[PDB]
């Protein structure tokens, strides 16, 4: 019932990492309501207005030499630093998937609880990879530092058929596999 | 490629600020403003790292000053409501008598205010439920998870109700075994 006007200001320091900490790019973004108004890109070393509303801030902040220098140093003092402080429980994090198969006409391969999110999931009917007929849920963040996904296979199975969902993920050396045949 | 975001906000009139760190879309931690302390998204993290919470209070004080300046410069132009997509799902596939977790996923919305209520069998649950803070997105909207542990059964049914100023009426989101 609260219809009062809302006003929002957001500040985001984005640290982008390529090949360990080999290439670091810092991106400070200023957003009013839904409109980013001014940013500092390390690739540039100065603030730039993104829209008119941000012009006064870029011009003004660009005139503070001591602070600008500090921002240019941030790739080392701030990004690379935090990268190291936190890298042993974030980047190195590995949590192994859990796989389950079951009919939903349609076979489902549930793969859940895993981290990181880069994963490979493939179906086989009687030993030959099936690719036509495969639909998926996409990747899904649970917000608790784990992912999940459903990979469906569309088929009508003759009995005595052995479908097999295989999953590959950096957490485990050998591909996980789960078998599923229908009954008469 | 990895991305570590330090994301801060301040919202008026609600007078709420937030300060958190994001790794590839997951919260590393945030600072509880009321308690003036650091809350790690997984307690484990706290074994390896520390973060002076008082730091965030000073940033928030600046963010607030800036919001007021900016509110005026815009000629008191308010944020446009963007209502969330809400979806309900579980930690794992569910088998009766095995403890699972219901997740209420609230996505693509602004401003960062929502009333979220869990219902077991039509009645409001507030014990064991938990939630994340408002998580950042490229398009500068937010997202958020609410969680409810449960013991799956045929006897029981669930809904997640979500209120946001951008919705004509509350979203009810049903789940049952």
């Amino acid at each position: 019932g609260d219809t009062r006007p809302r006003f929002l200001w957001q500040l985001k320091f984005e640290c982008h990492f390529f090949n360990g900490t080999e290439r670091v790019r810092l991106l400070e973004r200023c957003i009013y309501n839904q409109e980013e108004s001014v940013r500092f890109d390390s690739d540039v070393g100065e603030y730039r207005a993104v829209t008119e509303l941000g012009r006064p801030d870029a011009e003004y902040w660009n005139s503070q030499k001591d602070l600008l220098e500090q921002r240019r140093a941030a790739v080392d003092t701030y990004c690379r630093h935090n990268y190291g402080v936190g890298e042993s429980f974030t980047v190195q994090r590995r949590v192994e998937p859990k796989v389950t198969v079951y009919p939903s006409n349609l076979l489902v391969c549930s793969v859940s609880g895993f981290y990181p999110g880069s994963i490979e999931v493939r179906w086989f009917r009687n030993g030959q990879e099936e690719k036509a007929g495969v639909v998926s849920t996409g990747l899904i963040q649970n917000g608790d530092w784990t992912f999940q996904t459903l990979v469906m296979l569309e088929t009508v199975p003759r009995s005595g058929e052995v479908y097999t969902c295989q999953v590959e993920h950096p957490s485990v050396t050998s591909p996980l596999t789960v078998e599923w045949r229908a009954r008469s | 490629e990895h991305v570590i975001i330090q994301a801060e906000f301040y919202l008026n009139p609600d007078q709420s600020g937030e300060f958190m760190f994001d790794f590839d879309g997951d919260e590393i931690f945030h600072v509880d403003m009321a308690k003036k302390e650091t809350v790690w998204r997984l307690e484990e993290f706290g074994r390896f790292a520390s973060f002076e919470a008082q730091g965030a209070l000073a940033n928030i004080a600046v963010d607030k000053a800036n919001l007021e300046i900016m509110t005026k410069r815009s000629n008191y132009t308010p944020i446009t409501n963007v209502p969330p997509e809400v979806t309900v799902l579980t930690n794992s596939p569910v088998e009766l008598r095995e403890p699972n977790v219901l997740i209420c996923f609230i996505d693509k919305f602004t401003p960062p205010v929502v009333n979220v209520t869990w219902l077991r069998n039509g009645k409001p649950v507030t014990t064991g439920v938990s939630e994340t803070v408002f998580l950042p997105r490229e398009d500068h909207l937010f997202r958020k998870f609410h969680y409810l542990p449960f013991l799956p059964s045929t006897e029981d049914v669930y809904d997640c109700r979500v209120e946001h100023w951008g919705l004509d009426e509350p979203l009810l989101k049903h789940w049952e075994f």
């Binding site: 320091f13 003004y60 701030y78 935090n82 402080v85 | 965030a56 940033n59 600046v62 963010d63 000053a65």
Partner: peptide
């Protein structure tokens, strides 16, 4: 006028 907030640092715990 507008002021710049500070990039903040996590720290390693003595292990």
């Amino acid at each position: 006028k507008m002021r710049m907030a500070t990039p903040l640092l996590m720290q390693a715990l003595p292990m």
